[PDB]
Amino acid sequence: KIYGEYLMLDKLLDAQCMLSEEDKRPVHDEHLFIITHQAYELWFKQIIFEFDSIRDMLDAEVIDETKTLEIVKRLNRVVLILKLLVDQVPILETMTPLDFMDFRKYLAPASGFQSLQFRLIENKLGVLTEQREEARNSIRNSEKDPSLLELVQRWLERTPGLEESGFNFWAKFQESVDRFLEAQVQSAMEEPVEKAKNYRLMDIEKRREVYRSIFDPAVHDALVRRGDRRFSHRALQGAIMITFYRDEPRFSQPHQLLTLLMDIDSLITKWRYNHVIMVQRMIGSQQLGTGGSSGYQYLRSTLSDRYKVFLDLFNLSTFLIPREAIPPLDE
Template sequence: MIEDAGSAIAASASMSTLSAATRTLEHDIFKDGEGGRTGRSNENSNDSVPHQEKLLYGNYLKLDKLLDCQKLVTEQHCEERVHDEHLFIITHQAYELWFKQIIFELDSIKPLLDFEIHSPLIKVHPYFRQPLRIPCDSQDMNESNMFQITSRMNRVVLILKLLQEQVEILETMTPLDFMEFRGYLAPASGFQSLQFRLIENKLGVKNELRVNYGKQHYQKVFEDPSAIHKIQESEKELTLLQLVERWLERTPGLEPHGFNFWEKYQNVVKRMLDQMEEDAKKRRNYSLHFWTVMTSPT
């Protein structure tokens, strides 16, 4: 009982601390008259906006529109709505919002990796006393961007993991529950998700590796000309895979006309193996020596 009471007190204290931290965070973000936790000047604060137009949580997130997007078809065609259709809509809308964030991240990463590679030049590295010729690009990639690139790519990976976990929520709806309203959704299909196709193209999925939907090219499911145009434009862009490959191809130390890394590496390994062989030959094999003594004529 004491342990249970102690656990309850600890849990209550943790909840109180969490609640206080949440209130502090909300106050820092949305408080009036100061720059909030961004540290910006009052010129950009809510005090410079007329009272009726001040930024509030609801209008900042456009919740009036966002929360009004769940229109159940069973409310229109059935005497009584199907309860699980609401979950179905919410889940897929959440997917599309996360798809939008993934596209936003990928579109910010690709320019950081997009640079031109020119013929390698030769320069003297200031670290060495003796001049050492090493290759360099006439337009080097800014390697300081790598933190942003990896950070945003990690974010994309975490979003994809979250999307996978969302399936478990959808699985609380049984197949029979789904069939109660599935007939009203035809011919709608997840294959018609424009953003999902854009993500595939931006990552580098090749057309020849695609499985045709209904024995047709994946573009055929889209009837909106603007959607087709976006897909076609995404197919023309350099993909993330191509940009990463190009970044790897310009990695210093791989150019044969400058500092040939692989040749130096092979030479070092060969010297190491030769030294090991020489050491082995110098060591005395006592078993062999004893056998030689015993079998040699006296």
């Protein structure tokens, strides 16, 4: 009912135990170390709570405009929380390496993941397991149950406009590309400067390779096997269609949903980068007790594209054609 009881502050504010104080050698900054991590864990619980509710709203055949608005609200809220978590790094960087060295003896390393909740966030978003008892159950369920990556793909596959009997976007798009590149060739052929004519013709050939990568499903499949793409061919067609008509009321919220998924992915990378810089400022690439630089090198490897979930969304503008060449909406 009242503030302190409602928020269970007697339990929350009783979870801070400084081991350097227990051992009669107190390091003042150990309190900061505990609070910073606990604030991260409170916000990780919030992100998991948001992610699970979004996963449940996406696990349905019909996703209406009303539910789409609520998914956008929750994804945007996760973006704000992640921005706040990135800003928590300079607060811990205020602790000197020598002060950290005076209490790191009371800390034990991890045999698997560092944080249970951080791993649950990674798995629920769609971070690849191959591209790397209640707690074991949580990890198993996060690996077996559909991730946001998979659920977003199912939603994109059912994008209205892709059906052959209806708007038939994909065929109209290949048709428009052919006419657009034909017009570019004719315009390039009339270039008075020979150098500019040759450059434009080579550039039109680069566009042809780009369109082959999406219009030939076998080329798309090879990129998925290679790890360059993750989306199914139909999820990519839906995602491309959404970027083309983002100005249209019917596609603005679906587009904002995709934009926010990219923002979340990008903010997780920014957290990883800020964390690895803080780690290096505290203990360098290796220190006494670390057994070499394997911990630091592992953190650096998490900065690769193998860890980005919605890599496909970042490249969508490669396939764009100008407004005048885009197939006009019928309905």
